[PDB]
Design a protein around this ligand. Structure first.
Ligand SMILES: C[C@@H]1CN(Cc2ncccn2)C[C@H]1c1nc2c(cnn2C2CCOCC2)c(=O)[nH]1
Ligand SMILES: [Mg+2]
Ligand SMILES: [Zn+2]
Length: 328
């Protein structure tokens, strides 16, 4: 809708606007356009202003982060973009700038971007069972999440990537601690533990209680991380196949190496529909239900697409099961 054509990395006013909503089609963009989107978020949220981030350093940092993501079917730079874009959408939807400080927004955004750095495409169960260098280094304690974290701080230690260079040491330590808590909280083995702790605080929630806010930030990063099904069907659906592509690579390797295989990774046991029905019903919907108690606007924007998705996979399951029965 402009008088002349601008290159892809110069985001159109329409893209800038659409970027604020969970309906944003994450598939339409090349890495350079996604990098421009992430950069806009830091300026738009007032993070460049409030933390005196050098605008060039922000770009170098984002480019370095992009480079440290692997070309995996799921755990890649586009996934990193989803999580950060969903976080950014949640800041607007939930009016997080009213409830959280700029330091908290910075932690939420930086942890969302860094949460899966250098992911190898094989989960913690593979690392542990195969006794990999990562499992040995981290003593079987969230090896991947600990690594994503370490890589995040290794990038920030490079002077041309240090977006925190103008932040006083006390501020840096505060951001570092918060980011470590958030990235480590993305380990799904801790889901029930984190959900229970949050629900316990939800009995009488306090926005001025640091412990309550830490748990809310952990729940927010967890929400964003597994949020694909909140997105429109056309955007959400291709992500399941990407994850299954990664899971099948792992189970094949586990079979070959004589290691235990998880049923949800077994090509003959798992179906996209049955895997998604369960995940939506027992992981996604209950998690977003607890958030809705604090942010009532999350029901219409995030629970409604989850209900629609659950109902569509139930339809797909009826057809898929009948189809798979003819195949034998
Ligand atoms: C098709 C996936 C099979 N999995 C079954 C399952 N059941 C119980 C426990 C674990 N998995 C649930 C499915 C699933 N996993 C997701 C999604 C998003 N992130 N993850 C994951 C969350 C974990 O970290 C990697 C991405 C999703 O939409 N579906
Ligand atoms: Mg992860
Ligand atoms: Zn992730």
């Amino acid at each position: 809708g402009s008088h002349m054509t601008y290159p892809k990395y110069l985001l159109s006013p329409e893209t800038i606007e659409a970027l604020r909503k969970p309906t944003f089609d994450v598939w339409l963009w090349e890495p350079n356009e996604m990098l421009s989107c992430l950069e806009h978020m830091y300026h738009d949220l007032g993070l460049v202003r409030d933390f005196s981030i050098n605008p060039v350093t922000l770009r170098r940092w984002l480019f370095c982060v992009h480079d440290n993501y692997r070309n995996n079917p799921f755990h890649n730079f586009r996934h990193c973009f989803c999580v950060a874009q969903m976080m950014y959408s949640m800041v607007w939807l939930c009016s997080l700038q009213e409830k959280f400080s700029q330091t908290d927004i910075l932690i939420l955004m930086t942890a969302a971007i860094c949460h899966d750095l250098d992911h190898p495409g094989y989960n913690n169960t593979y690392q542990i069972n195969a006794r990999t260098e990562l499992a040995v280094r981290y003593n079987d304690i969230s090896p991947l999440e600990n690594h994503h974290c370490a890589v995040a701080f290794q990038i920030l230690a490079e002077p041309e990537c240090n977006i925190f260079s103008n932040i006083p040491p006390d501020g840096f330590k505060q951001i570092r601690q918060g980011m470590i808590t958030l990235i480590l909280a993305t380990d799904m083995a801790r889901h029930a533990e984190i959900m229970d702790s949050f629900k316990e605080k939800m009995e009488n929630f306090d926005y001025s209680n640091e412990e309550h806010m830490t748990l809310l930030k952990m729940i927010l990063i967890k929400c964003c991380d597994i949020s694909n099904e909140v997105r429109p069907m056309e955007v959400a659906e291709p992500w399941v196949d990407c994850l299954l592509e990664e899971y099948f690579m792992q189970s094949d390797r586990e079979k070959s190496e004589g290691l235990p295989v998880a049923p949800f990774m077994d090509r003959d046991k798992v179906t996209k529909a049955t895997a998604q029905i369960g995940f939506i019903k027992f992981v996604l919907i209950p998690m977003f239900e607890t958030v809705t108690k604090l942010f009532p606007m999350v029901e219409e924007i995030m629970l409604q697409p989850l209900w629609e998705s659950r109902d569509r996979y139930e339809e797909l399951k009826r057809i898929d099961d009948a189809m798979k029965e003819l195949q034998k």
